[PDB]
Coordinates of C-alpha atoms (C1' of nucleotides) in Angstrom, one line a residue:
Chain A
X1 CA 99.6 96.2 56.7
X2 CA 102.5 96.8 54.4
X3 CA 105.1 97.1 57.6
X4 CA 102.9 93.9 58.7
X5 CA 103.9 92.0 55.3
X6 CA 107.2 93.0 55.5
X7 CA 107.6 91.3 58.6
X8 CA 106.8 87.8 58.2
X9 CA 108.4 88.6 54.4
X10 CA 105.7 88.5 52.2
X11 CA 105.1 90.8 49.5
X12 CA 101.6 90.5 49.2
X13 CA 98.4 92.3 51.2
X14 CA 96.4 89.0 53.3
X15 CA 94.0 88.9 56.0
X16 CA 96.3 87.8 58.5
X17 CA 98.3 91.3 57.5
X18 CA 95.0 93.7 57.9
X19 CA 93.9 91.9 61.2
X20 CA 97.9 92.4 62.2
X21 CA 97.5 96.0 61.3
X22 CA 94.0 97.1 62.9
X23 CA 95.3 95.5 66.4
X24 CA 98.6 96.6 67.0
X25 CA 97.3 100.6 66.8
X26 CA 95.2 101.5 69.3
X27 CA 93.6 104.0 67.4
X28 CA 92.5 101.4 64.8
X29 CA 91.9 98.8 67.8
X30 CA 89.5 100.9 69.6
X31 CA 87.3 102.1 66.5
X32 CA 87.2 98.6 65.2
X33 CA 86.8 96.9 68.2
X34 CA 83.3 95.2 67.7
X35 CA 84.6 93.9 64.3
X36 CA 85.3 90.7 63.3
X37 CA 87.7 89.9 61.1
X38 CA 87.5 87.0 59.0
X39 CA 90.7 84.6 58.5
X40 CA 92.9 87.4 60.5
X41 CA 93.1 85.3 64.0
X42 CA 94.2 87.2 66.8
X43 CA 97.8 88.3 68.3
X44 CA 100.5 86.0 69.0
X45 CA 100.6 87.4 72.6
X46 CA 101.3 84.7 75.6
X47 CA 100.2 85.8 79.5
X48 CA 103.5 86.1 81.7
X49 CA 102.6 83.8 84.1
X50 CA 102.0 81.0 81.1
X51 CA 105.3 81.0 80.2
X52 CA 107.9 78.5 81.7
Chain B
X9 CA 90.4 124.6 88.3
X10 CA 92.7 122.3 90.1
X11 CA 92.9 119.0 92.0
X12 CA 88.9 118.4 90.9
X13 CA 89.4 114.9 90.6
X14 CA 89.0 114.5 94.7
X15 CA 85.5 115.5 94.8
X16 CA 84.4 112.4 94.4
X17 CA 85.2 111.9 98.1
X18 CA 86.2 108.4 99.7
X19 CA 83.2 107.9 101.1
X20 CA 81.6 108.8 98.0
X21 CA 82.9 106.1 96.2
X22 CA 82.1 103.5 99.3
X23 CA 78.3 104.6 98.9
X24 CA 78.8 103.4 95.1
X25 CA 80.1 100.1 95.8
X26 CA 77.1 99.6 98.2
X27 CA 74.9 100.2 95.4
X28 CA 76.7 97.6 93.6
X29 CA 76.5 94.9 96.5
X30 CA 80.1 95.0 97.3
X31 CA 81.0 93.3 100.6
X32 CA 84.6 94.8 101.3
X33 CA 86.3 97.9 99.5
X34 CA 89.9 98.0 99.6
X35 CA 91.8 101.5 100.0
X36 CA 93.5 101.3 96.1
X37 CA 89.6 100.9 94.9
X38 CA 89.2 104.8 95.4
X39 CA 92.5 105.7 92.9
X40 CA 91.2 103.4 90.2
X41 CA 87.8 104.2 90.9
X42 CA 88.5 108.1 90.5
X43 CA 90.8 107.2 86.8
X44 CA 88.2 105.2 85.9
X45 CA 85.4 107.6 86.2
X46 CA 87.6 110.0 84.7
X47 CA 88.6 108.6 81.5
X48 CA 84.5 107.6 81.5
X49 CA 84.1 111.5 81.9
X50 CA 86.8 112.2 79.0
X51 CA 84.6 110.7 76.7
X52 CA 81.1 111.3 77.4
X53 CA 81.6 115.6 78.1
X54 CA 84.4 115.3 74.7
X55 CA 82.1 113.7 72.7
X56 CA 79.2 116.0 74.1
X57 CA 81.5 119.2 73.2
X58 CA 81.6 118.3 69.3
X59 CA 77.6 118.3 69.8
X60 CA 77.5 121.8 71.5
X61 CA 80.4 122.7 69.1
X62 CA 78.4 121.7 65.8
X63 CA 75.3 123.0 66.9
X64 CA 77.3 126.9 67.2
X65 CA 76.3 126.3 70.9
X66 CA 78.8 127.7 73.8
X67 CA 76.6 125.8 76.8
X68 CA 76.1 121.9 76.8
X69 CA 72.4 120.9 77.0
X70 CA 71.3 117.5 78.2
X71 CA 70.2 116.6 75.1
X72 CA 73.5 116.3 73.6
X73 CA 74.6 114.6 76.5
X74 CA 72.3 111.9 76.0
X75 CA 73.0 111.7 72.4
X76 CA 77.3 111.3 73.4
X77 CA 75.8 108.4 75.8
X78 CA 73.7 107.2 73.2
X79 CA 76.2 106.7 70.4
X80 CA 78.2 104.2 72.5
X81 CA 75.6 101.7 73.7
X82 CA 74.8 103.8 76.8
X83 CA 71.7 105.6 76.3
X84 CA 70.1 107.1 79.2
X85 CA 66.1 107.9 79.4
X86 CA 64.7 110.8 81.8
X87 CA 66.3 113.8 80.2
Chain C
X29 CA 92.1 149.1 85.2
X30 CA 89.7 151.8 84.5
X31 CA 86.9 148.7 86.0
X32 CA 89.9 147.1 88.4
X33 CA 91.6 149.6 90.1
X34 CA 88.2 152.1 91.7
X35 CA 87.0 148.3 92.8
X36 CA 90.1 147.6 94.8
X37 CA 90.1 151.3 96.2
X38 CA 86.8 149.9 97.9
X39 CA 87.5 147.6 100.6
X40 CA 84.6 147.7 103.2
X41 CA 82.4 148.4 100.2
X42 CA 83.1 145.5 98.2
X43 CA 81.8 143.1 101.1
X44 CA 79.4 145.4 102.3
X45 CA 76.5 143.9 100.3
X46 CA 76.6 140.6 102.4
X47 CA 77.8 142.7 105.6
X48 CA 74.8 145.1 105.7
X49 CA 72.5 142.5 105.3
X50 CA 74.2 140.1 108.2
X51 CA 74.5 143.1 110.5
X52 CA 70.9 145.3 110.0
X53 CA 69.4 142.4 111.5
X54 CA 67.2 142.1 114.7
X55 CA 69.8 140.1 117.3
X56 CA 72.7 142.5 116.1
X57 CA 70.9 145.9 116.7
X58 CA 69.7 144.1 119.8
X59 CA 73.1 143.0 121.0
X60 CA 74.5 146.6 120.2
X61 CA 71.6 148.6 122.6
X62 CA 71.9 146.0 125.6
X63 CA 75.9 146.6 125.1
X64 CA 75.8 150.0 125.6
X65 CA 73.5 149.2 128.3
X66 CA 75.6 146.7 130.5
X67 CA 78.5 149.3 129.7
X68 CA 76.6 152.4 131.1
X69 CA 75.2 150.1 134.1
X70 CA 78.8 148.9 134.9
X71 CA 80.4 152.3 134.8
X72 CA 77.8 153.9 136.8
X73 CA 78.3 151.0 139.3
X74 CA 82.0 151.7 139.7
X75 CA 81.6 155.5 140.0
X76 CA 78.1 157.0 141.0
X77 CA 74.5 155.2 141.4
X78 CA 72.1 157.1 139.2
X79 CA 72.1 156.5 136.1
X80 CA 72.3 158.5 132.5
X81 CA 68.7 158.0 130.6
X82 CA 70.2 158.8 127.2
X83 CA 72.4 156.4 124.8
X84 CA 72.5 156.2 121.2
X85 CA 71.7 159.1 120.5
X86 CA 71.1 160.5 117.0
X87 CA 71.2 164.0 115.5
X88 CA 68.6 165.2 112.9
X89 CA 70.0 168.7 111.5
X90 CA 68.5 168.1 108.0
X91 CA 65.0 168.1 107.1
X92 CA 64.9 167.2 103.5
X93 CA 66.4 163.6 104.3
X94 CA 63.2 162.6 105.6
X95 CA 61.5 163.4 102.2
X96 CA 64.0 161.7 100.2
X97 CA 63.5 158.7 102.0
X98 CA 59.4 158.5 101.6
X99 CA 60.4 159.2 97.5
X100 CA 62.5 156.0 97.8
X101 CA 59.9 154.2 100.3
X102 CA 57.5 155.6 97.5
X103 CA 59.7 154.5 94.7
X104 CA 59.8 150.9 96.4
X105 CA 55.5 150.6 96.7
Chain D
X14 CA 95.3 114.3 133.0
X15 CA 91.9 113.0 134.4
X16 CA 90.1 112.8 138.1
X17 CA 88.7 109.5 136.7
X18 CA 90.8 106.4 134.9
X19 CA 92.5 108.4 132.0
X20 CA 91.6 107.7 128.1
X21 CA 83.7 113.4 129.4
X22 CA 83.8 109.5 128.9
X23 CA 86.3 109.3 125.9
X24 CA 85.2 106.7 123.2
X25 CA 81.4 106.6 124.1
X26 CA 78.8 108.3 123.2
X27 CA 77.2 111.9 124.3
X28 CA 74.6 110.8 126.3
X29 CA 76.5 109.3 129.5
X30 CA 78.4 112.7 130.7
X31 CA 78.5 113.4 134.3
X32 CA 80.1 116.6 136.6
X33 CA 79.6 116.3 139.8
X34 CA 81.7 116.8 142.3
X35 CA 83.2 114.1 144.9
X36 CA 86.2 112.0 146.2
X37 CA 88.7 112.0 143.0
X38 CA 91.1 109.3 142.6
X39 CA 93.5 108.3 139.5
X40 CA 95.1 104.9 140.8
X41 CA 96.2 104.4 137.0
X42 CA 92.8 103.6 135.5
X43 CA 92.1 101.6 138.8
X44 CA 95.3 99.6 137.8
X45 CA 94.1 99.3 134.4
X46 CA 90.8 97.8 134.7
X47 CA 92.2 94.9 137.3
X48 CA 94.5 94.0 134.8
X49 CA 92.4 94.1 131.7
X50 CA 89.9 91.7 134.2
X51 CA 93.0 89.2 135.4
X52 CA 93.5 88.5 131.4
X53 CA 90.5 88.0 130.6
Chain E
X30 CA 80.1 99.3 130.6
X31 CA 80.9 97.3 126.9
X32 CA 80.8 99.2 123.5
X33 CA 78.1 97.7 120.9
X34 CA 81.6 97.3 118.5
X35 CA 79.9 95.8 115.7
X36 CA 82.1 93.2 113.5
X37 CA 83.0 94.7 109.7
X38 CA 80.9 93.7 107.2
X39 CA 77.4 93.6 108.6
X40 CA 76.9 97.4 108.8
X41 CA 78.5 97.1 105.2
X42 CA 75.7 94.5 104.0
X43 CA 73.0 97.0 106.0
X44 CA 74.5 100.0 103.8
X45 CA 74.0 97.8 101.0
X46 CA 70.2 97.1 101.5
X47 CA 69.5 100.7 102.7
X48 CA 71.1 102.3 99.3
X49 CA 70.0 99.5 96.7
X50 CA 66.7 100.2 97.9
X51 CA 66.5 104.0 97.5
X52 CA 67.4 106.4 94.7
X53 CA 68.7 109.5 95.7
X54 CA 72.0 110.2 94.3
X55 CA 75.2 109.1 96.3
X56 CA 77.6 111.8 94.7
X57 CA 77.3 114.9 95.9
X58 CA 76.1 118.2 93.1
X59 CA 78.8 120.3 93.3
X60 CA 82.9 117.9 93.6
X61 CA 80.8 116.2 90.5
X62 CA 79.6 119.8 88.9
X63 CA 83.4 120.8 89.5
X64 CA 85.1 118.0 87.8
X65 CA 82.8 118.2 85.0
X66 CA 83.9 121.7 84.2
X67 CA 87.8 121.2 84.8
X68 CA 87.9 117.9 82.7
X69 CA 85.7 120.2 80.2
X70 CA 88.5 122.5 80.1
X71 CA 91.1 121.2 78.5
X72 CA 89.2 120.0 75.9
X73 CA 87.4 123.8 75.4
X74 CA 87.9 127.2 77.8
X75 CA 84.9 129.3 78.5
X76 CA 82.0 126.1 78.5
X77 CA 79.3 126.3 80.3
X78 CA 77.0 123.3 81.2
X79 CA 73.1 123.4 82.0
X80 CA 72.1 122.0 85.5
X81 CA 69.8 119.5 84.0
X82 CA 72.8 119.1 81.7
X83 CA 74.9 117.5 84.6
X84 CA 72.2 116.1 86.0
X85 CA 72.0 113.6 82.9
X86 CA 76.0 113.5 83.1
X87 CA 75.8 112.4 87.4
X88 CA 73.1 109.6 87.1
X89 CA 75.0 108.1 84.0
X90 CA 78.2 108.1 85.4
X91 CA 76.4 106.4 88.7
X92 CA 74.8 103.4 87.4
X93 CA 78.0 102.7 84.9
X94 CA 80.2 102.7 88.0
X95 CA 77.6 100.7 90.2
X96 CA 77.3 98.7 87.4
X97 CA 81.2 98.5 86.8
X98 CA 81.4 97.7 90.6
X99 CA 78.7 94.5 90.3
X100 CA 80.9 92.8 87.9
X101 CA 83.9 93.9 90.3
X102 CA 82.5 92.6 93.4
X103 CA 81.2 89.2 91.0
X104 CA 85.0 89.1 90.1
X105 CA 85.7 88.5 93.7
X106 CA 83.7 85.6 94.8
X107 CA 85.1 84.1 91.3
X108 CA 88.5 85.0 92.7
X109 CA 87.3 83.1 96.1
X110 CA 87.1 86.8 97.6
X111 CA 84.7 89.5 99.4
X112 CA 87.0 92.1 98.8
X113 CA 87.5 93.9 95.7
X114 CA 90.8 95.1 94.5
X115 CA 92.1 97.9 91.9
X116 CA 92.8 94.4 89.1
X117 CA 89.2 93.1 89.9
X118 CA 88.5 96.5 88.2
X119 CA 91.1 96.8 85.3
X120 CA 90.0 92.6 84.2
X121 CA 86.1 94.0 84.2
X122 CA 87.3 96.9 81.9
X123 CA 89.1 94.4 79.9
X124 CA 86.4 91.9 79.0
X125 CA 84.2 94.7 78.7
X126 CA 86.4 96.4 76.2
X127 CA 86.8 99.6 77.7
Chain F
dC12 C1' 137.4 72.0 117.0
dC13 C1' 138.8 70.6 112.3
dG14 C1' 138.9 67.3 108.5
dC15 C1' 136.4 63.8 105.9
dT16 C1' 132.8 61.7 103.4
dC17 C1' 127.6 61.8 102.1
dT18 C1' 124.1 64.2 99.8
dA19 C1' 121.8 67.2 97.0
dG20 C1' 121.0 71.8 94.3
dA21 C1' 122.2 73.6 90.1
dA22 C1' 124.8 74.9 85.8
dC23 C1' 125.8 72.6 81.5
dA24 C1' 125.8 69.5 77.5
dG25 C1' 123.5 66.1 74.5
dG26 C1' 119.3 64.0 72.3
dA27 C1' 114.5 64.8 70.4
dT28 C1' 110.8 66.4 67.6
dG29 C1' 108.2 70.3 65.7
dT30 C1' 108.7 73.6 63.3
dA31 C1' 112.3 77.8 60.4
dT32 C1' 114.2 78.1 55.5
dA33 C1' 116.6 76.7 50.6
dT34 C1' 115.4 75.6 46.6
dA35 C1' 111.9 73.0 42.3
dT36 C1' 108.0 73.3 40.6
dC37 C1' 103.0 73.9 40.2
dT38 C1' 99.5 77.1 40.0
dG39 C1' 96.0 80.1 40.4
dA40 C1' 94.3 84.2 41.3
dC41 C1' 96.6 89.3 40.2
dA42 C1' 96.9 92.9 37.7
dC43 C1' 97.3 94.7 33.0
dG44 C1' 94.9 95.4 28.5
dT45 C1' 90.6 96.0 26.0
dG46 C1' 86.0 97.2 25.0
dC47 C1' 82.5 99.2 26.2
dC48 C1' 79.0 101.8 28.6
dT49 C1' 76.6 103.8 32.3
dG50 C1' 77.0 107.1 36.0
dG51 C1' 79.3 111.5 37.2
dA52 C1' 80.3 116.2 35.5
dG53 C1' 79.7 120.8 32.8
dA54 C1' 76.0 123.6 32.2
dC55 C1' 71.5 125.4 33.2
dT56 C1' 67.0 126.5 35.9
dA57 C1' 64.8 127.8 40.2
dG58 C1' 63.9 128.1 45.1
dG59 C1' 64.5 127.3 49.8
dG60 C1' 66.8 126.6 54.0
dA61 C1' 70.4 128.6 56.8
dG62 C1' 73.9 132.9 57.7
dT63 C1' 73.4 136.8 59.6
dA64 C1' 71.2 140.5 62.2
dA65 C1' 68.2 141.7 65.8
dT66 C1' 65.6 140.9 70.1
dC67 C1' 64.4 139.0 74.5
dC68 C1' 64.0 136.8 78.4
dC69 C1' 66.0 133.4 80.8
dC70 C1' 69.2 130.7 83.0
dT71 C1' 73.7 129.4 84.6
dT72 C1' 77.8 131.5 87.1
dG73 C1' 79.5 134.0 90.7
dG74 C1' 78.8 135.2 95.4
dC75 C1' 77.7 135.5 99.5
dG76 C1' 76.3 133.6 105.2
dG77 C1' 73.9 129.1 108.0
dT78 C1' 73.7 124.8 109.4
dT79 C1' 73.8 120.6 110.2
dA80 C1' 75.2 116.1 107.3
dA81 C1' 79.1 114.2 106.3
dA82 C1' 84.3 113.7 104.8
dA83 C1' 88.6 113.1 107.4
dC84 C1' 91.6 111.7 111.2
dG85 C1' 92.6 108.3 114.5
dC86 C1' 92.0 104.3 117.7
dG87 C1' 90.5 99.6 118.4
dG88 C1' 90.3 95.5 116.6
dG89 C1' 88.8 91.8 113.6
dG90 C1' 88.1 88.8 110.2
dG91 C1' 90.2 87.8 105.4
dA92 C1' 94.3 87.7 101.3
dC93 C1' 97.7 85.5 100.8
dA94 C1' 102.1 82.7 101.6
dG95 C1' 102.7 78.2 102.6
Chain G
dT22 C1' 96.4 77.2 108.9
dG23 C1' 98.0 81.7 110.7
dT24 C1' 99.0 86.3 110.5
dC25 C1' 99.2 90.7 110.3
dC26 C1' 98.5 94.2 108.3
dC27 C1' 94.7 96.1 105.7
dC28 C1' 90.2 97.5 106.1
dC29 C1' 85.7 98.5 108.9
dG30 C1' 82.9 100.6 113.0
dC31 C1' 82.8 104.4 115.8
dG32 C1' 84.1 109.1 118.6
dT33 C1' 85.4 114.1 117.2
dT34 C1' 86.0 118.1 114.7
dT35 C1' 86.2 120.6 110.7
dT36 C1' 84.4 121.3 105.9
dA37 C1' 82.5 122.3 102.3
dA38 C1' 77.1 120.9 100.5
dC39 C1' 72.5 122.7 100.0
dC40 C1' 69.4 125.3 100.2
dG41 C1' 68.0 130.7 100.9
dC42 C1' 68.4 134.9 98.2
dC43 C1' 70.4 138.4 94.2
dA44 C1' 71.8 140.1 90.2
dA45 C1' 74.6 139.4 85.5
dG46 C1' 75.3 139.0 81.1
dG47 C1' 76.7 135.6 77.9
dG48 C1' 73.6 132.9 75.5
dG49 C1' 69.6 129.6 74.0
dA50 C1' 65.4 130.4 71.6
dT51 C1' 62.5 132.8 68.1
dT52 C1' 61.6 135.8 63.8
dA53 C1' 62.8 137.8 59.5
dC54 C1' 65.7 139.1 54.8
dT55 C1' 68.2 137.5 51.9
dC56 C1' 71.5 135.0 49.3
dC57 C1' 74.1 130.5 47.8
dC58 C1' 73.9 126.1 46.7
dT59 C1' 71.6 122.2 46.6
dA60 C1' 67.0 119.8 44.4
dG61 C1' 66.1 118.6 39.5
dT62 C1' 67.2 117.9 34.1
dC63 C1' 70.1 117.4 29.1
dT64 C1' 73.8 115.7 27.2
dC65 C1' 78.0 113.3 27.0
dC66 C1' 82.4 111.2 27.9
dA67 C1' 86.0 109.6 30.4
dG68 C1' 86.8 106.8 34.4
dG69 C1' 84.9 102.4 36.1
dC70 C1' 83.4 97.6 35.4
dA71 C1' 83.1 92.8 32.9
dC72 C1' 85.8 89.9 30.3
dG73 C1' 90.4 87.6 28.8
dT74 C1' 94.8 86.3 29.8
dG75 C1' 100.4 86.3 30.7
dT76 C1' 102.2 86.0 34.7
dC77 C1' 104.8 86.2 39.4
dA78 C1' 104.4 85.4 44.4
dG79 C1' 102.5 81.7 47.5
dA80 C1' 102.1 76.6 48.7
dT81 C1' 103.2 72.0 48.4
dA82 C1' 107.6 68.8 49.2
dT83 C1' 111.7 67.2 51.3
dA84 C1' 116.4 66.9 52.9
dT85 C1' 118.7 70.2 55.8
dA86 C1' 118.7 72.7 59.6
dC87 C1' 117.3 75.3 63.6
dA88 C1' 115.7 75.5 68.2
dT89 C1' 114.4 75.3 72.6
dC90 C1' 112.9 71.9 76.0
dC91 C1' 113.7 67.8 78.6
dT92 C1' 116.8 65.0 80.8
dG93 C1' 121.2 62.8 82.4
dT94 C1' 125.7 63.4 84.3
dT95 C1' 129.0 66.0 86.9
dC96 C1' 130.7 70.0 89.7
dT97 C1' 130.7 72.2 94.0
dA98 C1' 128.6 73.8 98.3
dG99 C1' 126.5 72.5 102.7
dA100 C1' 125.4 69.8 106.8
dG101 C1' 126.5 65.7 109.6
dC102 C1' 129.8 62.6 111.9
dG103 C1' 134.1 61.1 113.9
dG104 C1' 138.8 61.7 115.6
dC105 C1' 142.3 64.3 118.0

DNA sequence: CCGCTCTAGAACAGGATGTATATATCTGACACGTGCCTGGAGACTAGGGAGTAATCCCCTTGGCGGTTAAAACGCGGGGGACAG
DNA sequence: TGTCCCCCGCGTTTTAACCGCCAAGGGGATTACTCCCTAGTCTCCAGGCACGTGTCAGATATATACATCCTGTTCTAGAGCGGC
């Protein structure tokens, strides 16, 4: 969550960071995967053939 | 122990899909179906080795491996 | 080696537990008289018409054999 | 290499073998069934 | 003389009613006994597994592929198809979560 | 058969509108400080459930032939996935 | 709509599957002795929680600025036509 924050350059721990976090591993995807996560969204991931 | 993952035989994995009520099988179904089955197999005997391996057991009974199908919302009745 | 090397001396032996029990059958002993038969018959055929009365024969120089064997028959009841 | 049109019956079943002996003739699989029956 | 030649798919759909009907096990004892053991391997050597033991492990692993292969097969009559494919498998997995 | 003009695909540049940032300032929870105070820890008592040892009988693995059901190979062909 | 190549139905020949039978020896299951540590209290005290508050990162705001996407115009290649 910390490498999250540091991404979109913000120095403080929010939901949007821990949801970030838990995704992107797959260790932490898997184990938490009937979770919901409240104001965390989900990845900013597009499918290919969506894209222009 | 080598090359174990072709027992479950071509035809083997036709009679399945009949089970299922599938009209056509293509011939990639069999690879996918084999990886499939074996990652399914990675989890249920691993997780049913820390049972036999907290219990100070060196044989795996059936119970534990209806308590590793249990614990992920597969629980099996007859054993 | 002291359990590996006497078991690879023995190389009839090690399959002989399956082999005498494939071979002391009926059909096999049966098969190995009517051989000797059709051998003795085809011989006698090619070189002179009568024929031996005596094949297989067996030799019995030791009397105490007999008795071990009831003691095992015994052991077996 | 067969008396009969070349392919035992090969690609039928068991139960329609005959050996008996008569007249044998090739002639290319009597010219290929008549030409697969004129083309159908 | 004409052979019987019957068209694919009906024999298929008679394979499917003689085998959703019954319940003996499709996988053979032993290939499935012997991939048990090797996959059992590399997590731990010198494991041993009770016959009943697999037994539970077979008739799982069964009904979660026949069950795997309904959604498959209802993938492809979504997809406008009859016949399943390797991604019919890997999108059931997905929305499964597996 | 070669040159000329017509036509059209495609790379490229410019306009457009919804967002990426550079401050200005509010602002509102964040974390630090304080005062407790209530639950964990040192110490103690007692006992009971498993570690360990032994037994035992039992049950899974290895190991054979037999056989006939079935996997595998291949040929014919046929209906369907997919490009269009 | 077509096709063609990908998959099914069937003939043949191996092939390992299952049951038939036999021991083996690690190993599951049971019983018992005993020994540690966890059940259960007394007291307390130092870390954790409720309260209060200065404060520092985030959001609102807006001209500025990206920023890529859509579209218009121009460049160049290709096919068609006409003359020598």
């Amino acid at each position: 969550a910390g490498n999250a924050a540091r991404d979109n350059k913000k120095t403080r721990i929010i939901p949007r960071h821990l949801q970030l976090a838990v995704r992107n591993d797959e260790e932490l995807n898997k184990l938490l995967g009937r979770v919901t996560i409240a104001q965390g969204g989900v990845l900013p991931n597009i499918q290919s053939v969506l894209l222009p | 122990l080598r090359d174990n993952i072709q027992g479950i035989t071509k035809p083997a994995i036709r009679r399945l899909a009949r089970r299922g009520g599938v009209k056509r099988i293509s011939g990639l179904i069999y690879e996918e179906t084999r990886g499939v089955l074996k990652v399914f197999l990675e989890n249920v005997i691993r997780d049913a080795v820390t049972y036999t391996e907290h219990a100070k057991r060196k044989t795996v009974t059936a119970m534990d491996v209806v308590y590793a199908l249990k614990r992920q919302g597969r629980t099996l009745y007859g054993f | 080696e002291q359990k590996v090397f006497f078991k690879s001396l023995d190389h009839l032996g090690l399959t002989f537990k399956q082999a005498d029990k494939k071979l002391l059958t009926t059909k096999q002993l049966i098969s190995e008289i009517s051989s000797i038969k059709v051998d003795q018959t085809n011989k006698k055929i090619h070189w002179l018409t009568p024929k031996p009365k005596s094949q297989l024969d067996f030799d019995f120089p030791d009397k105490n054999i007999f008795y071990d064997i009831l003691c095992l028959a015994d052991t077996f009841i | 290499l067969a008396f009969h049109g070349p392919l035992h019956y090969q690609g039928w079943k068991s139960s329609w073998d005959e050996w008996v002996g008569y007249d044998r003739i090739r002639a290319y699989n009597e010219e290929n069934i008549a030409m697969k029956k004129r083309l159908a | 003389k004409k052979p019987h030649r019957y068209r694919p798919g009906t024999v298929a759909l008679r394979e499917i009613r003689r085998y959703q009907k019954s319940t003996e096990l499709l996988i053979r004892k032993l290939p499935f006994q012997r991939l048990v053991r090797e996959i059992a391997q590399d997590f731990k050597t010198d494991l041993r597994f009770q016959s009943s033991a697999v037994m539970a492990l077979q008739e799982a692993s069964e009904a979660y592929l026949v069950a795997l292969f309904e959604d498959t097969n209802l993938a492809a009559i979504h997809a406008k198809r009859v016949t399943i494919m390797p991604k019919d498998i890997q999108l059931a997995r997905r929305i499964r979560g597996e």
